[PDB]
Every structure is written in C-alpha cells, then in structure tokens.
Design a protein around this nucleic acid. Structure first.
Ligand SMILES: [Mg+2]
Ligand SMILES: [Mg+2]
Ligand SMILES: [Mg+2]
Ligand SMILES: [Mg+2]
Lengths: 59, 175, 104, 119
RNA sequence: CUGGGGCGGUCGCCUCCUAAAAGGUAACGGAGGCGCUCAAAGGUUCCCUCAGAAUGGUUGGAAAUCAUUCAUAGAGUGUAAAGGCAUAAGGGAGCUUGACUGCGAGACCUACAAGUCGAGCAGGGUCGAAAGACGGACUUAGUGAUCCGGUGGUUCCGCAUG
RNA sequence: UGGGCUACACACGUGCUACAAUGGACAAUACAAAGGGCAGCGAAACCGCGAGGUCAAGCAAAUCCCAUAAAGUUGUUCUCAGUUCGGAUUGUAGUCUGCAACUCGACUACAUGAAGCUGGAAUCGCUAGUAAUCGUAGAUCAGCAUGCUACGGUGAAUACGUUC
C-alpha cells in the first residue's frame, strides 16, 4: 500500500481476439482506445498474445 | 480482483465433491506467492542487480526485498551483507492478478509440450515452479532489457498433502 | 525518428537503422521531397507524409529485434548455420584459416 | 501447508517479557489490558498478594454499545478509574499486556489519565 | 629463576585444567590469550528469533538464495577461554549522549600500597505514553608507582609593599 | 552414396580491395586490340529493381554473335571524419547451372555496416611504351579465378658515377 516504492499497475484489459482473457496487469501505460465494460476500464494495450488462443496441452 | 470468483466457484463445486470436506473453512486455500529470483552471484552483478530489481518490479508491481547473505562460505565470494537475492511475497489480490495472468502465458511462451511438471511438491502442499525468464514483460517487448535471467515462483497453500494441492493446481493449471 | 539535420535528406535517413539508399527512391516516391533539403527544409508538414511511409517499414530499431531472434531461433535448433554463431566462426561456409579475422 | 499462529500466544510471550519489571504493590497497583477482537478488559491487580482491586470490561452491561471499538475503550478507562476512586485513587502502573501502546490500548489509558488516575 | 652451574627458556596481567563438590593451594605441570577495539559495537524505547535437518525449487558447486516442517539454543554474543544469556546479554529500527557533576551507607578483596561492587543522595539531563531506565560495551585481560618535566585552569601562597 | 581434401588459439608466403576531395555518387558522351563460338555464341524485341527468363533474327563465320571496353572527357554534386570515404560480416531474392549447392558454389536484391587515415625495423619489382594503372579475352569448365596466360588504353621519375 506504500506510496513511493510501487511502480504503476492497472486493470490491463488483455485485448486478445480469441475470447479476450482480460485478467492481467503490468506496466502497459499506453494509449487507451477501447475499454470493454465487462473488463478492466483502462488501456487495451495488450493487443495480441498467444495466451488463450491455442494451448499446447488443451489443444 | 475480477477473477477471484474462480476460486470461490471451485471451493464448493469441485472440492466439496472431491474429498467431501465437512466444512467450507477447511478447503485448501492459497496464502502467498513468493517470486524469489535466486542468487546471481554479484561480483559484478551488483549493477545487474539494479536491473534485476527493475525487471521484477515489472513482473509484479511491488519492490523486491534484496535478501543478503548469512554465512561466510568459501569457494564463493560473499560475506554478511553482499545482497544476493530478491523476492516479493504476493499476499492479496495481486496474487490472483498475477496467478490468473501467468498460468495463461507460462506454457505458451516457454514452447514446452507438457510445460511444468506432473509433480513438483514437497509432500506438504508447496509447488516451487522454476522459470528461465521466457515469459516476462509481455507488454513492452524485448527493447531495453539487457541480460537473460531465471526466476522462481513458489506457490504456498493451505493444502495438507500432495493430492489436495493437485486439486487447486487443476484450476487452469497444466500438470 | 532520430535523424540528424544540416545534411541532405538522401543521406540523412541513412543514419537510422534500416535504411541505405532507399530514401533516394522509396521515401522519395511517397513524399514530395527534393534532393537539396538541408536543415532549412521546413519538413514538419513533410514529417507527416514520411511518417506514413516509414510506418510500413521495420527499419527504426525494431528490425534488430527480429534480427536478434532469428539468430536465437537458429542456434536453438542447433544447425550448422547456427553453431557457427555460438562458436569465432565465419558462418557462410568460408575458409577459417589465416584470413578469417573479422569473426575472430 | 503453512501454520497460522494465534495472536494470543505470541501476545502472552510478549506480555510475560513485559511483566517482569512491572508490578503492583498496593501503594502503586497495576491495571492490565486484555483486548480480544470485540471487547477491551481492564483490571487493577495488586501483584503482591495476587488480589485484584477492580475490574472493568467492554461487554459489561454498564458500558455496552457499538460505538467505534475505540470509544468503547474510552468508556472502560472512564469506568476503571471511577471504581478506583472508591478506594486507592493513587498512582498505578500501566500494563499494556503484550499489545502496543496504540489505538484501543492507548484510548484505555488516555481515558484513565483524564479521569483521576495519576499514572 | 634454575632438580649444580652454564646454555636454552622464563619474568606483567586474562582465562581454564591440575585443585581433593566453599574459598585458597606449588612445580622448568597441561592449555591458551592480552599491551586493544567501538561515536554505535554506548544509552533508551520498540519490535524480532537462531544453527542445523530434511523436503523441492529459473541460479543449481555438495553447500549462495526461496518455501515448508522439525528444530533448546546445537546459532550468535568486537576480541583468548570459562561462566553466562531466547528476562535476551542475540538480531533490527527510532530518538539520543548517563562513554554525566558532587558524592556515597555498606560490602568484597588483601601484608602494605593497591583492586572491586554498590543501594541511595543531590545537581543537571536523555529515552519512554507512563512506571521507569541510564555514572560505557554479557562478565572477567587491553597496562606502569613516586620523583621530575610540559600544558591549561585556579577566590591559595608569593619574603618591606605593589 | 556419405564424408574429407574447404577444419582452426594461431605462424609465415603471394595477391585482391582499400584507407579518398589529382577522389566518391549521378547523368551524358567517345576511342581499342586480341580471342572465342561442332545444339555452341545467342542479337534486336520484350517481361523482371536486378542477377536474368520466352521464342524466333542471323552462323559452323574478315561478315552473325559474345561486345556499349574501362580509365577518360562534359556537367551537376557532397565539403576535408572512421562523413555520400569501403562494404568485411550477418538475415531477407530463392536468380542460374547442374540427380543434387547442408557440409561446400556463382552472383544481385533491399538491410546491416567492422577493421582501415598511407604503415616501424626491414624488404621487393622496374631503365620507354618499361614502372604504374584501366578494362577486355581465352585455356581449363555443366557451374566457379582476386590465379594463370595473352590483349590493348593511358604513362612518369631517374642513372653524376664505381667507392661501398
Ligand atoms: Mg640432581
Ligand atoms: Mg575449590
Ligand atoms: Mg557457540
Ligand atoms: Mg541489546
């Protein structure tokens, strides 16, 4: 909770075109363009990933 | 703290029907995630530690604790002091924000088939996953980081034996 | 991006990563620039029209990101084209006797 | 697994350490503190005989509200002094238990200083 | 000094053992240390508890670091050893200077000189909400008389007086 | 058939290209000689940024083709920096030859641009169309030379003297 030592984080809406598994965070303090209301109303700057599009295990 | 309800679903939908617990309190519960990076012997890496304390803040947004040495072991150059570690204990909702992020981006970027293990436990309910730093900074790409590295993520739960900690790790985990 | 002033633009865009003598033709195609544009060029309304054509290119630094991982992919498969990177080997099938110095 | 400690046992160790140079002798008695999670308990003990002189509590019917849990501790510190104004209103020794001098243990002691007790 | 003397060695303090369940007790008996160090390694108020063992975990030396469970102290305690100690005397943090002045009833030790411990009393502080705690370091070594000389104070003397 | 003769922390020979503004980059515009061409040389057209592909035009050749030599000259340029000096080395074109270019070829295409500012002691070549430079041919050869062998273009300086 301490002020001064923390970096930034926010509700990073992981905008992936396959089902948009938006439960992530980090330091993507970039352009906020489209925020889904069911998801984190913040920057969608996670633009593309292989997170939950095709798992190697549950293929 | 959105997908915390994934746990609140699985406490009564799967775990009450698997082991048949007699009360909702004694379901196995995750308490802390420590992301202890490791040693990285700093005869020179005390400047790379300033990078290593900068990389781990980007993974989890809390400042690491630079853990120092304890003994004066020879065939190793270190004394009391000589900061040769870093860790962040992730207690609250930052755990689940890190957990429901990492278990979707750990197996894909590692390019492994199975990916972690079938067993890594210690007979008590603690996992200790091992990372060679192929996953982190998923937002800003490989632009300004310098040296390849290797993390270590430990999952400490209130599980009692191995098979109850397999049940919590069977919620979007890949054993 | 980070080009220098006080020189001609046919040699000025060369100073960044990813352009050598394509600014004479390819950047000259899209933008209506000339050859004698010094620091006194007023290339601010022309900064936008070169920004549209440089956005299609991989040039400014980001090509070296893909160039680095192409070697990293090549050594991970452990090919003969890739072992020569990790081992000072000239890689493209050269004679590794006396006059092979620039790879050491 | 991980074993969660109870906060009473650690408190007891701390209190034991505290209460080795801290004693009441009936010319200067000792009030100690037991806050649990809801209620604050105060009690004047003379440590020589092992005999108390007074007792107050946040769950007693004279002072039982749902005020703040801090203003409840202020009511108990008002209560233990006006019962120690019946006998032995002299100096006492504040015993914090194993708790910090902060919040509810402090408001129990701030209230007793401004209600006749001279510690 | 000396199991003649010489040669060698030794000479002052500290710690054990010899020491015979108080103290004390010799040998050219058996073991070792000291001729300092620290402005925090002192003061005080707060928190805190170790080594080791398994176990399993990007560094992987066996053994750095991380987590769990056992751990009575096996750790640590400026420095030899012996007594101590988790009241922590060990480990952190915050404030600070009591690493004060004048004393001291009483006691230990002892041939003398010396040496040691002190409640308490003022004075004036520091820390703490307070009670209180503070006249140096966990304790026990880290030194050397008198005479002479230097230096700074000093309501003292200073030769007939100043 | 598959490797190897092509390996390398290195050490000497022999050459190539350079370390530039008596140059570099782009436009124009000249002038040769020698030799080859038995399905080989393959024009002029096209289609490709280019390496080059598709057929016929000619011919077993003083005529047809390789083949527009290049340096030069003329003009515009950069301004004296490891800069428009050069281009080594690495990924992108898959061009062509050939059962097949990974060991292990040949170019060009956009990238990347490293050593290198004329070299110490020493040492070598050379007396006129010669040193120096510039490009063109052929033999080998399916493909492949910075080598070799022949070819022309431009072309200095210097020899008082025999004592070392
Ligand atoms: Mg004798
Ligand atoms: Mg005795
Ligand atoms: Mg010890
Ligand atoms: Mg202490």
């Amino acid at each position: 909770m301490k002020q001064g030592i923390h970096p930034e984080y926010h509700q990073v809406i992981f905008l992936d075109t396959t089902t948009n598994f938006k439960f992530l965070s980090g330091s993507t303090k970039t352009s906020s363009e489209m925020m889904e209301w069911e998801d984190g109303k913040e920057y969608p700057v996670i633009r593309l990933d292989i997170s939950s599009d095709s798992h190697p295990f549950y293929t | 703290n959105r997908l915390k309800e994934k746990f609140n679903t699985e406490v009564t939908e799967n775990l009450m029907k698997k082991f048949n617990y007699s009360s909702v309190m004694e379901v196995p519960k995750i308490d802390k995630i420590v992301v202890n990076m490791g040693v990285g012997d700093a005869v020179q890496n005390s400047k790379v530690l300033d990078n290593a304390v900068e990389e781990l803040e980007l993974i989890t947004g809390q400042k690491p604790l630079v853990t120092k040495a304890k003994k004066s072991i020879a065939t190793f150059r270190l004394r009391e002091g000589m900061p040769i570690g870093a860790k962040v204990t992730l207690r609250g909702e930052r755990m689940y924000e890190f957990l429901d992020k990492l278990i979707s981006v750990s197996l894909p970027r590692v390019r492994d088939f199975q990916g972690v293990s079938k067993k890594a436990f210690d007979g008590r309910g603690n996992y200790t996953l091992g990372v060679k730093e192929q996953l982190i900074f998923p937002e800003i790409d490989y632009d300004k980081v310098s040296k390849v590295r290797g993390m270590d993520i430990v999952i400490v739960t209130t599980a009692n034996t191995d098979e109850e900690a397999r049940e919590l790790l069977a919620n979007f985990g890949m054993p | 991006v980070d080009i220098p002033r006080e020189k001609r633009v046919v040699i000025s865009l060369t100073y960044i990563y990813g352009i050598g003598t394509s600014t004479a033709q390819k950047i000259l195609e899209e933008a209506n620039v000339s050859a004698d544009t010094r620091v006194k060029d007023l290339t601010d309304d022309e900064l936008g029209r070169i920004r549209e054509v440089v956005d299609g290119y991989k040039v400014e630094g980001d090509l070296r990101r893909e160039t680095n991982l192409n070697i990293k992919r090549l050594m991970e498969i452990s090919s003969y084209r890739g072992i020569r990177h990790r081992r000072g080997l000239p890689v493209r099938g050269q004679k590794t006797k006396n006059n092979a110095r620039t790879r050491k | 697994m991980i074993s969660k400690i109870d906060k009473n046992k650690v408190r007891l160790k701390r209190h034991a350490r505290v209460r080795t140079n801290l004693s009441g002798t009936a010319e200067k008695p000792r009030l100690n503190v037991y806050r649990s999670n809801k209620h604050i308990y105060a009690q004047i003990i003379d440590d020589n005989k092992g005999v108390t002189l007074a007792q107050a509590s946040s769950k007693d019917s004279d002072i039982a509200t749902t005020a703040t849990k801090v203003e409840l501790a202020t009511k108990v510190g008002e209560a233990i002094a006006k019962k120690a104004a019946d006998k032995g209103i002299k100096e006492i020794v504040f015993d914090r238990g194993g708790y910090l001098y902060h919040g509810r243990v402090k408001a129990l002691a701030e209230a007793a200083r401004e209600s006749g007790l001279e510690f």
